[PDB]
Amino acid sequence: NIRIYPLSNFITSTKNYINLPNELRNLISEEQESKLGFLHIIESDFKPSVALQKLVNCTTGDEKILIIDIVSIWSQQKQRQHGAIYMNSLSCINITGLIVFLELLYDSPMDALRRCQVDNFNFQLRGIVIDNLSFLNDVINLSKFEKLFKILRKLREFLGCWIITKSFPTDFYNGIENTLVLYPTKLPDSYMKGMDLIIYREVVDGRPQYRRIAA
């Protein structure tokens, strides 16, 4: 029954981990960050905050980030970066198409990546980013978001990518003239319970401050 492990087991992984930018240090211990695999950011910004940009524009070498760009910001011609692959499709702007696409990515990464116009497969998929889960928004909503979480968790187990998602804060969900009127965002716990770090961005003056939400 004795187990003796080479130390190299504890320092080697088949998984990628999220490397927080400065804006986000001092939120979790060094042990906690040594292993961020799922990060959710809540921010009121349409476009990505500078911390989100920093998390994402984080390509080492032959490494790529797949950006599922529901909002059509990151894949715009003037915004595109070399370290990213993009999915920006009318087949992938609602939660049913997104899950079909992510299921294909798990079953047959080559086929799914072909949709994103990847000619060559010479790279490690380091991360998947989905922007903005608030646009995928009963009790059937709970079902679809757990299904989304479960496929993203399977993806991380098989491919090793980390996952970063974004949503708008509670305000967006009030709707136009408050006509649609926990966390400071309206996503189910079937999703949020899965996050290793939930970050919230707010402006308390005209200063944006990032805080952990261990809510």
* CA pair distance 40, 187, nearest whole angstrom: 11
* Residue closer to other proteins, measured from CB, 126 or 166: 166
Ranges within 126-145 binding other proteins (CB under 8 A): 135
**Residue number with CB closer to other proteins (17 or 172):** 172
38 lies in the site for other proteins, by CB under 8 A: no
Residue whose CB is less far from other proteins, 23 or 43: 43
Contacting other proteins (CB under 8 A), which of 110, 142, 180, 182?
Answer: 180
Report if residue 46 touches other proteins, rule: CB under 8 A: yes
Half-sphere exposure of 199 (CA within 13 A, CB side): 26
Contact 156, 162 (CB under 8 A): yes
Least distance to other proteins, CB of residue 197, Å? 24
Task: Work out how close the CB of 172 gets to other proteins at its nearest, in angstroms, rounded to a whole number.
Answer: 6
State the Cα–Cα distance between residues 162 and 166, nearest whole angstrom.
14
- How many residues in the shown chain lie near other proteins by CB under 8 A? 25
Strand, helix or coil for residue 113: helix
- β-pair type (63-69, 84-87): parallel
What dihedral angle (degrees, nearest 10) is formed by the CA atoms of 103, 104, 107, 112? -140
Selected range binding other proteins among 22-30, 98-106, 119-127, 179-187, rule: CB under 8 A: 179-187
Site for other proteins in 58-117 (CB under 8 A): 70-73, 75-77, 88-90, 93-94
Give the integer Cα–Cα distance in Å for 21 and 19: 7
Contact flag: residue 178 with other proteins (CB under 8 A): yes
- Quick check: 188 and 199 in contact, CB under 8 A? no
Binding-site ranges for other proteins (CB under 8 A): 44, 46, 70-73, 75-77, 88-90, 93-94, 135, 168, 172, 174-181
